[PDB]
Design a protein around this ligand. Structure first.
Ligand SMILES: [Cl-]
Ligand SMILES: [Cl-]
Ligand SMILES: [Cl-]
Ligand code: NA
Ligand code: NA
Length: 129
């Protein structure tokens, strides 16, 4: 599913990401834009052999099982395919675990490099929330 900007904003807000661990909604929308272009089906291989899955590009090295990442934790107790569904619940629930683990949203390289320190509010401007 390729989300609209405000459509994803409203879905993440419904799932409680707005101000979760102090990260305003625009941070999560910005990160999704640059991680996945709002596309739940996005998959990308990392340098280390693992793969990133879904709207927030969650990694199989630690967070989900994709059956091909040696030394893999599955800390969200989920097949990585569950992160590709039109329903973003698994992605959001797993992301809440990641962002609660110490490094906040710096776990998302695209957030760190393209959202952090920017006007993340624009990403939810114009949305009815
Ligand atoms: Cl629209
Ligand atoms: Cl585990
Ligand atoms: Cl919660
Ligand atoms: Na915001
Ligand atoms: Na894994």
């Amino acid at each position: 599913k390729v989300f609209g900007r405000c459509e994803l904003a409203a879905a993440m807000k419904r799932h409680g990401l707005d101000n979760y661990r102090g990260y305003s909604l625009g941070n999560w929308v910005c990160a999704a834009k640059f991680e996945s272009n709002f596309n739940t089906q996005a998959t990308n291989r990392n340098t280390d052999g693992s793969t990133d899955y879904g709207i927030l590009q969650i990694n199989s090295r630690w967070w989900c099982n994709d059956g091909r990442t040696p030394g893999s934790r599955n800390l969200c107790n989920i097949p990585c395919s569950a992160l590709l569904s039109s329903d973003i619940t698994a992605s959001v629930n797993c992301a809440k675990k990641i962002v609660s683990d110490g490094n906040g949203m710096n776990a998302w390289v695209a957030w760190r490099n393209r959202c952090k320190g920017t006007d993340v509010q624009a990403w939810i401007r114009g949305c009815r929330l």
